Structures are given as structure tokens and as C-alpha cells.
Amino acid sequence: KSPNVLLQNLCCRILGRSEADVAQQFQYAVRVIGSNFAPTVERDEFLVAEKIKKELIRQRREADAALFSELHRKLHSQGVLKNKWSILYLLLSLSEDPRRQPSKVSS
């Protein structure tokens, strides 16, 4: 796929609105992605792994801070990806407070 129409697919997954109903949301997506069209940011995924472990200690669940460490190893173990840093940076930035996480299935 081309990235520009991929933005409009993303807008119809997040919002229930169709891609012909609105064009303003897609225009804002074009506003931010355009003139940032190429990757120029740098990754330091070592520091961000060390920052997820401090967060999982902060929950005061310490067995799960080391379970994430072995699940974080597996992304390098397969290694079919582009950057391991990018999706993890996205998923860290959108965080809300589970207050201490009153459950986790642990797969």
C-alpha cells in the first residue's frame, strides 16, 4: 500500500466514520505525516527497554517486570522487523495509568 491512503484506512478503524463522510481528519493526518514523510528520528531502544523495566517495578509487581524482559528478548530473537523501537515508542507514549494493574493474564 501507499502510505497516504493507509492514513485514511487508519481513520476509519479508529473512528466509526467513513472515508467519504469526513475529509478533515484525513487532512490532519496528511498535515502531520507530510513534511515528515521520510524517517529522520533516531532510535535508542536500549534506554527505552530500561525505562519499561523501571515502570514495571513501579507497579510493585516484580515478577512481571522480568517476564516482560524475556518477552522483550523474543522480538530480537525473531528479528523479521524493521525497528523494534518504533511500535514500542508508540505504545509507551499513549500510556494511561492502570493505577497498579489489578490483573494480568500473562498469556
Binding site: 512481571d64 518504533s86 508508540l90 495509568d97 494493574q101 498469556s107
Partner: protein, 65 residues
């Protein structure tokens, strides 16, 4: 083949571990939205862009709808 289904396995595993990572960091993104974002970062794209967009698009259906 075998290495062609093992390549199809190696995305399906990673999408399953990232699904655990998505709920323990508490985002509002589910698996369906996750698959689009993982394709975008498979091509390579600023996550700093994507974060500001989704902070607005999620804010575009809880006060505008």
C-alpha cells in the same frame, strides 16, 4: 514450502507478544488498530508523528461524536 510458512509464523508470533505489550502499557489501541500501526512501522515512520495523530483522533470521537 516450510520457510515461507515459518516467515508467516514469525509475524504472527510477534503480533501476539505485542498484544501483551499493548495491554500492560494500557493503550486504547486494540489488535485491529495495532495491525495498521505495525505495518506503518514496518515501512519505517516517525512514532512521534503517529502518537500525536492518535492522541487527536481518539480525541476526535469522545468530544466530537
Amino acid at each position: 514450502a516450510a520457510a515461507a510458512a515459518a516467515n508467516l509464523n514469525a509475524v504472527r508470533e510477534t503480533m501476539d507478544v505485542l498484544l501483551e505489550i499493548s495491554r500492560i502499557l494500557n493503550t486504547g489501541l486494540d489488535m485491529e488498530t495495532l495491525s495498521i500501526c505495525v505495518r506503518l512501522c514496518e515501512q519505517g515512520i516517525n512514532p512521534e508523528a503517529l502518537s500525536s495523530v492518535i492522541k487527536e483522533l481518539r480525541k476526535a470521537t469522545e468530544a466530537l461524536k
